Amino acid sequence: PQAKYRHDYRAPDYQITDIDLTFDLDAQKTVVTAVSQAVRHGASDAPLRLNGEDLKLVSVHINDEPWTAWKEEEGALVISNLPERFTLKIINEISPAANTALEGLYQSGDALCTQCEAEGFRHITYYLDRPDVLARFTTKIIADKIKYPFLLSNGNRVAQGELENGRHWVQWQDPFPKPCYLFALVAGDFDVLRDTFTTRSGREVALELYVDRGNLDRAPWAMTSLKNSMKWDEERFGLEYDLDIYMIVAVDFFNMGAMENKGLNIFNSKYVLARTDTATDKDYLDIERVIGHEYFHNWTGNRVTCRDWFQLSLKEGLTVFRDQEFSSDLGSRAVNRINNVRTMRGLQFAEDASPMAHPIRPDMVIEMNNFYTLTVYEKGAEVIRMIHTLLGEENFQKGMQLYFERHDGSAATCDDFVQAMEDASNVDLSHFRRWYSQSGTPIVTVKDDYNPETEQYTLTISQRTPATPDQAEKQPLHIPFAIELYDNEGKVIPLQKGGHPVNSVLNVTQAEQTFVFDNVYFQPVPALLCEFSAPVKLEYKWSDQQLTFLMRHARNDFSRWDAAQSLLATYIKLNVARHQQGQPLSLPVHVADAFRAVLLDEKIDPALAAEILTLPSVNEMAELFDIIDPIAIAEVREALTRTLATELADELLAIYNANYQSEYRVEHEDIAKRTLRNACLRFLAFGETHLADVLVSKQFHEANNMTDALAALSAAVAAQLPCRDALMQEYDDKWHQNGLVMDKWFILQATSPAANVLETVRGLLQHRSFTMSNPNRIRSLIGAFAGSNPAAFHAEDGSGYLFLVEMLTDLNSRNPQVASRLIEPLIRLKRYDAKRQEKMRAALEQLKGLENLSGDLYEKITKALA
């Protein structure tokens, strides 16, 4: 497999302006007729090179003349000797039922559906499968009326007909030119939830949510979230929907989360279906996030698209930013920020320290499906957020406005977007652009001094990004570094110098620089990198008392949680070292006291309390260490939980009871109280065994919603309580017919601390609710084991690696995209001890030797073994 490079981008030799597609649909053999109007822009002797994969070519015509001047090559149809303007007609066959990779046209249960991003359209017909080729689509679909009574594509229905032999047809037209990755087709039988949204300016939009027969009871929340997204984009960004119909189709078989195809989004059912007995608070908020996300792409991705796939973050960073802003505006901003920062520090930093490290705008890609990453998405969003921090909301919105004014109806670049922001705001972003080109996590080191003679506070701030596998050269970045200074009363000290106020967002642009502040009337306690103002690791020599002071006094709830994290980091590191020496947990009394104070604080937002009382995950803990000891981390997390459970037992039970709610509401105040109650339950489960077992069993049985039931079940598994096996069996017996609900149970099985967890996981490959044919099931059992049970995955006998090799040997052939998702824990080998590295290396070497190794896995394996 050959790498492609960003610097090799060149405008296409040919454009296509219009394409008329006909599908004669059948699961075994679908016939595609594609009539394209093409224009040559390149040299008169340049051939037209069409991408195509796994197509059976039937005929090629140019202006209705059977064409003799063509050849098929690997992945392509090369057509020579063309006029400047012409009509290309391709007829070819494909086989949806054979498509186990779920890219192009495939089968999802009884439905046929498409996934074209990034390069799936070339699995449907021979085309210019590149996002800088925008064309106006019409789509005619012909199918069996009984099997496929709904035939959907992008845009509006313009024609329909009936045929003999029980077939019918519908034709769709989408007026907006689009790259082919935004093409969608769906055929099947569905229940349909229909509603309406009227835009600010009065455009009535028909909303249609297509779900499998019998699932209408699970559709209203997704519909509500769609309307909420539409309203918010109007209010916040001044953007209205631009078509007459908005369709969403929920499908069970889908490699990612959801897809923004123009006017016809296709969603993994996990991000659509919810009822209070099947879905948790987290599920509701994720449906809200993902519905919003795909909707927000209508402008940031569709109306302005990507010139090439190296510009993926142009749409993903910005749309992730938009979905975060949506969730934050509607819900708790602090909880959203906290959770997004957990993801950055615990998962994205890991990627940036791995063989797969890349800038948010990659320079080199072998398989583009490998670059739908934490970096491109979540770090991409942090980069957009830094622009927002530097510009402020008003200037940022001016930049958005200029971006659309310049680029609406075209494919643009990351650089185009930065230039629009810079031009609209008059803020210089020339240095800032380096965030697009440089991979790895910067480390920002802060030293301070207080001078009582002059009442000056001095911050000496340095930065460096360590070399990464992809880049030997690193340079200083433009780091927006937000600070606050607190006096002894917990009041904010005004930032000033030489009689003039100083902006609290410091521009850290050099390898080292000093900032001096005047009229600092008391030695300050600083809050540093406020609201995680740049995606960096902070090195500052905090005292415990500075941190507990911030937990008490910091103005922003994020800073209070972040202070608690810094406090915990010290003792997590202490206790991992102790575990390695065979010693039990040690924790100063004043540390437990800080968490007691959070429990008993009557003024603190329960949403914030809940997050402070949620310990960093084993993944967040891992990124505190150069060399990861996953067993020590797991056992320290448990020991810390047990210690706090014992020290805080009375307080935990009081707060658990105080936050009882008889009514279940998907409302932010209620969610906050419930998150706090369940955080308390988690500790209580690790307290005295009998009380724990009673409390957990009672909550599981008395729960009137899945949030509370799952919290209890999860605690029973985590703490290995007597009731565990009974509760797990009850859940299976009740829910086995419901895959999405069973995913939660497979996750609990996979992440179990039980000694026999791998045995159980292997056995579950035969479970009635499991199938290797379904990405969600695969991710919930196998993925959760490898990625979310590192203690078991990294068992010293190497059994975890061997299991993953076995699974990837199947998935490499079946569904390379899912295989590539699942190989990730194995490519982190350099973070582990020598003995583990050698076993993981052996595992990777076995995979490298697979017959018919997918490009997806090849790219990751070669980087890992380098």
Task: Find the residue with minimal CB distance to Zn ion.
Answer: 319
Q: Which C-beta is closer to Na ion: that of 231 or that of 537?
A: 537
The partner in contact with residue 351, picked from Zn ion, Na ion, ligand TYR, none with C-beta cut-offs of 5 to 8 angstroms by kind, is Na ion
Q: Which C-beta is closer to ligand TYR: that of 370 or that of 614?
A: 370
Report how far residue 165's alpha carbon sits from residue 128's, in angstroms, rounded to the nearest whole number.
35
CB of 502 to Na ion, least distance (A): 19
- 293 appears as a binding residue in the annotation: yes
Distances (CA, A) of 20 to 36, 72, 140, 183: 6, 23, 8, 12
Contacting residue, 25, 209, 357, 412, with Na ion by CB under 5 A = 357
Task: Find the residue with minimal CB distance to Na ion.
Answer: 375
DSSP 8-state symbol, 42? S
Q: Which C-beta is closer to Na ion: that of 448 or that of 531?
A: 448
Q: Which stretch binds Na ion (CB under 5 A): 308-316, 353-361, 565-573, 815-823?
A: 353-361
Task: Find the residue with minimal CB distance to ligand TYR.
Answer: 256
Instruction: Please tell me whether residue 215 binds Na ion under the rule CB under 5 A.
Output: no
Q: Which stretch binds Zn ion (CB under 5 A): 316-324, 407-415, 711-719, 754-762?
A: 316-324
CB of 506 to Na ion, least distance (A): 17
- 663 appears as a binding residue in the annotation: no
Instruction: Please tell me whether residue 352 binds Na ion under the rule CB under 5 A.
Output: yes
| DSSP bridge pairs for 814 | none
The CA-based angle 283-289-290, given to 5 degrees, is: 90
Instruction: Please tell me whether residue 92 binds Zn ion under the rule CB under 5 A.
Output: no
The partner in contact with residue 256, picked from Zn ion, Na ion, ligand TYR, none with C-beta cut-offs of 5 to 8 angstroms by kind, is ligand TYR
Contacting residue, 294, 351, 416, 708, with Na ion by CB under 5 A = 351
The partner in contact with residue 307, picked from Zn ion, ligand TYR, Na ion, none with C-beta cut-offs of 5 to 8 angstroms by kind, is none
Q: In what order do the strands lie in the sheet with 258-259?
A: 191-198, 204-211, 245-251, 264-268, 258-259
CB of 439 to Na ion, least distance (A): 5
- 316 appears as a binding residue in the annotation: yes
CB of 547 to Na ion, least distance (A): 15
Q: Of 750, 676, 737, 735, which Cα lies nearest the Cα of 708?
A: 676
CB of 300 to Zn ion, least distance (A): 9
Q: Output phi, psi for 112, to 5 deg.
A: -110, 135
Residue 681, classed as helix, strand or coil, is helix
Contacting residue, 448, 518, 544, 635, with Na ion by CB under 5 A = 448
Task: Please give the full DSSP string across 304-366, using - where no structure is assigned.
Answer: EEESSGGGHHHHHHHHHHHHHHHHHHHS-HHHHHHHHHHHIIIIIHHHHTSTT---SS-SEES
Q: Which C-beta is closer to ligand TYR: that of 256 or that of 861?
A: 256
- HEC string of 118-136 equals CCCHHHCCCECCCCCCCEE
Residue 294 catalytic?
A: yes
CB of 376 to Na ion, least distance (A): 9
* Greatest extent of the chain over all pairs of C-alpha atoms, in Å: 96
The partner in contact with residue 255, picked from Na ion, ligand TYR, Zn ion, none with C-beta cut-offs of 5 to 8 angstroms by kind, is ligand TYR
The CA-based angle 770-773-779, given to 5 degrees, is: 65
Q: Which of 294, 367, 378, 647 is catalytic?
A: 294
CB of 623 to Na ion, least distance (A): 13
- 234 appears as a binding residue in the annotation: no
Q: Which stretch binds Zn ion (CB under 5 A): 315-323, 439-447, 491-499, 586-594?
A: 315-323
Q: Of 291, 323, 319, 324, which Cα lies nearest the Cα of 219?
A: 291
What residues from 372 to 391 belong to the interface with Na ion (CB under 5 A)? 375
CB of 394 to Zn ion, least distance (A): 26
Task: Please give the full DSSP string across 225-241, using - where no structure is assigned.
Answer: HHHHHHHHIIIII----
Residue 515: what residue type?
F
- HEC string of 632-649 equals HHHHHHHHHHHHHHHHCH
Report how far residue 458's alpha carbon sits from residue 483's, in angstroms, rounded to the nearest whole number.
12
Answer whether 359's CB lies under 8 Å from 438's CB.
yes
The partner in contact with residue 115, picked from Na ion, Zn ion, ligand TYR, none with C-beta cut-offs of 5 to 8 angstroms by kind, is ligand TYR
How far from each other are the two terminal CA atoms of the chain, in whole angstroms? 16
Report how far residue 376's alpha carbon sits from residue 70's, in angstroms, rounded to the nearest whole number.
38
The partner in contact with residue 352, picked from Na ion, Zn ion, ligand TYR, none with C-beta cut-offs of 5 to 8 angstroms by kind, is Na ion
CB of 85 to Zn ion, least distance (A): 35
Report how far residue 33's alpha carbon sits from residue 564's, in angstroms, rounded to the nearest whole number.
61
Q: Which C-beta is closer to ligand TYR: that of 293 or that of 839?
A: 293
Instruction: Please tell me whether residue 441 binds Na ion under the rule CB under 5 A.
Output: no
The partner in contact with residue 375, picked from ligand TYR, Zn ion, Na ion, none with C-beta cut-offs of 5 to 8 angstroms by kind, is Na ion
- 260 appears as a binding residue in the annotation: yes
Q: Which C-beta is closer to Zn ion: that of 404 or that of 793?
A: 404
Q: Output phi, psi for 401, to 5 deg.
A: -60, -45
Cβ partners under 8 Å of residue 314, min gap 6 = 306, 412, 413, 414, 416, 417
CB of 138 to Zn ion, least distance (A): 26
The partner in contact with residue 259, picked from Zn ion, ligand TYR, Na ion, none with C-beta cut-offs of 5 to 8 angstroms by kind, is ligand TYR
Residue 585, classed as helix, strand or coil, is coil
The partner in contact with residue 357, picked from Zn ion, Na ion, ligand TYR, none with C-beta cut-offs of 5 to 8 angstroms by kind, is Na ion
CB of 226 to ligand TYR, least distance (A): 14
Q: Which C-beta is closer to ligand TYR: that of 272 or that of 444?
A: 272
Q: Residue count at the site for Na ion (CB under 5 A)?
A: 6
Q: Which stretch binds Zn ion (CB under 5 A): 181-189, 311-319, 418-426, 754-762?
A: 311-319
- E strands, 25-84, where? 30-40, 48-51, 56-62, 65-66, 70-73, 76-79
Instruction: Please tell me whether residue 319 binds Zn ion under the rule CB under 5 A.
Output: yes
Q: Which C-beta is closer to Zn ion: that of 298 or that of 776?
A: 298
Torsion of CA 416, 418, 419, 425, to 10 degrees: 140
Answer whether 794's CB lies under 8 Å from 758's CB.
no
Q: Which C-beta is closer to ligand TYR: that of 42 or that of 257?
A: 257
Q: Of 224, 317, 213, 323, which Cα lies nearest the Cα of 272?
A: 224
- 261 appears as a binding residue in the annotation: yes
Asked whether the CA dihedral 361, 363, 368, 373 is positive or negative, the reply is negative
Q: Which C-beta is closer to Na ion: that of 252 or that of 352?
A: 352
- 259 appears as a binding residue in the annotation: yes
Residue 833: what residue type?
D
Distances (CA, A) of 400 to 39, 391, 433, 435, 581: 32, 12, 17, 19, 55
Residue 206, classed as helix, strand or coil, is strand
Q: Which C-beta is closer to ligand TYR: that of 117 or that of 647?
A: 117
List of residues contacting ligand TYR (CB under 6 A): 115, 117, 255-256, 258-260, 293-294, 297, 316, 372
Q: Which residues are annotated as a binding site for substrate?
A: 117, 257-261
Annotated catalytic residues are 294
Q: Which residues are annotated as a binding site for Zn(2+)?
A: 293, 297, 316
Q: Which residues are annotated as a binding site?
A: 117, 257-261, 293, 297, 316
Can you give the binding site for Na ion, defined by CB under 5 A?
Answer: 351-352, 357-358, 375, 448
Can you give the binding site for Zn ion, defined by CB under 5 A?
Answer: 316, 319
